[PDB]
Amino acid sequence: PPTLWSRVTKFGSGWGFWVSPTVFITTTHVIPTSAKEFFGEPLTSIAIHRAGEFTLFRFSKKIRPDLTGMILEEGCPEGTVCSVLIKRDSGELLPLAVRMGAIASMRIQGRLVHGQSGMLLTGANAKGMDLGTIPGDCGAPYVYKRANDWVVCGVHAAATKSGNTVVCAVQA
Amino acid sequence: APPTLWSRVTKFGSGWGFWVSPTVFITTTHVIPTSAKEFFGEPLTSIAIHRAGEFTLFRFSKKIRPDLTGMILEEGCPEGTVCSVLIKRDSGELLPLAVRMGAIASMRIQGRLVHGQSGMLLTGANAKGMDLGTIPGDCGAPYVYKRANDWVVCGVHAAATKSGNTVVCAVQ
Numbered sequence: 001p002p003t004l005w006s007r008v009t010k011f012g013s014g015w016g017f018w019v020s021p022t023v024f025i026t027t028t029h030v031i032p033t034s035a036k037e038f039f040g041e042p043l044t045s046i047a048i049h050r051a052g053e054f055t056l057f058r059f060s061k062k063i064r065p066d067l068t069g070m071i072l073e074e075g076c077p078e079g080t081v082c083s084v085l086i087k088r089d090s091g092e093l094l095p096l097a098v099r100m101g102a103i104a105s106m107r108i109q110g111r112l113v114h115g116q117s118g119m120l121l122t123g124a125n126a127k128g129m130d131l132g133t134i135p136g137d138c139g140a141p142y143v144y145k146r147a148n149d150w151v152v153c154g155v156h157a158a159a160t161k162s163g164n165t166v167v168c169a170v171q172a
Numbered sequence: 173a174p175p176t177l178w179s180r181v182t183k184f185g186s187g188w189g190f191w192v193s194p195t196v197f198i199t200t201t202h203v204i205p206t207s208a209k210e211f212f213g214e215p216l217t218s219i220a221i222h223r224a225g226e227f228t229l230f231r232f233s234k235k236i237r238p239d240l241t242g243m244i245l246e247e248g249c250p251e252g253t254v255c256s257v258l259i260k261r262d263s264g265e266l267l268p269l270a271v272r273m274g275a276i277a278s279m280r281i282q283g284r285l286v287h288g289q290s291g292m293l294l295t296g297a298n299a300k301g302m303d304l305g306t307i308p309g310d311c312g313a314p315y316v317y318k319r320a321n322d323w324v325v326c327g328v329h330a331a332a333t334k335s336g337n338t339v340v341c342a343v344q
């Protein structure tokens with residue numbers, strides 16, 4: 001039975017997430033700007049829905065038929081604790097707890113990013129240990145469990161140099 | 173976590189153990205087969221076994237792992253330390269689970285009385301199950317943290333509560 005982790009896939013300059021056999025979500029800035037296909041499908045066959053730093057792809061055929069469809073929502077209630085599902089090219093999997101806040105336009109290393117704010121709950125400074133995000137992590141999904149149901153609520157768009165603050169881009 | 177730490181994590185009995193040095197191997201007592209008389213092709217005679225509850229240390233007369241340097245083993249860590257539990261999963265995926273350590277504790281978990289250093293997972297809010305939390309096959313995985321320029325091992329995985337949010341480190 002396929003884990004959540006099998007849905008996290010290397011893509012462009014970062015990552016994305018399979019919501020169902022036909023639906024893939026990612027951060028807009030990691031998508032190649034020169035392409036004629038993705039995952040073997042011509043771009044003519046792909047519906048692309050862009051909303052700021054959130055992009056959804058809907059494929060005309062089943063790319064990941066091994067998966068069931070899961071619930072995608074437009075962010076989550078303020079105060080929800082989500083996990084960001086970070087994969088690294090070493091083969092490490094780094095699920096990190098994040099407390100989610102308001103939807104806002106936030107100044108992150110001198111640039112405006114719009115999405116749902118969050119604060120990492122892994123403590124003082126990750127630097128040294130596997131406790132924080134890095135630039136190559138963009139497009140990792142934000143997920144949480146709600147009774148028996150898993151929910152995905154957005155994708156990793158930005159983080160401060162400091163480490164504490166992240167932005168989860170969300171569906172419009 | 174550094175490659176040399178992952179190199180020390182060894183599939184053993186019904187779980188894992190960890191090479192502290194060329195001659196010293198630590199594990200959780202319950203993953204050792206009750207009938208076993210040989211370890212790394214050496215007989216019991218040629219091994220010094222030091223057992224304290226669910227913590228077992230093996231000291232070999234011969235260098236079994238001459239590729240390794242000896243590192244620091246401590247008796248648990250200060251309350252408040254964030255550790256990584258070095259868990260290997262189905263296919264070369266490496267899961268360094270973040271945990272905030274607390275007090276020494278005595279608990280009853282399912283059918284067992286367990287004693288060691290308690291902690292709480294920092295991977296998400298509802299960690300039960302294999303994606304964000306521990307499973308029974310994880311017993312013996314090491315708890316490690318970075319101190320200034322050194323890494324330390326401070327225990328081995330012994331148990332997790334029914335909810336999966338609390339874990340127990342067996343300590344020397």
Ligand SMILES: Nc1ccccc1OCc1ccccc1
Binds near residue numbers: 081296
């Ligand atoms: N919820 C909340 C409310 C106030 C301050 C922190 C908070 O996070 C809770 C929390 C959950 C998982 C792992 C660590 C912490």
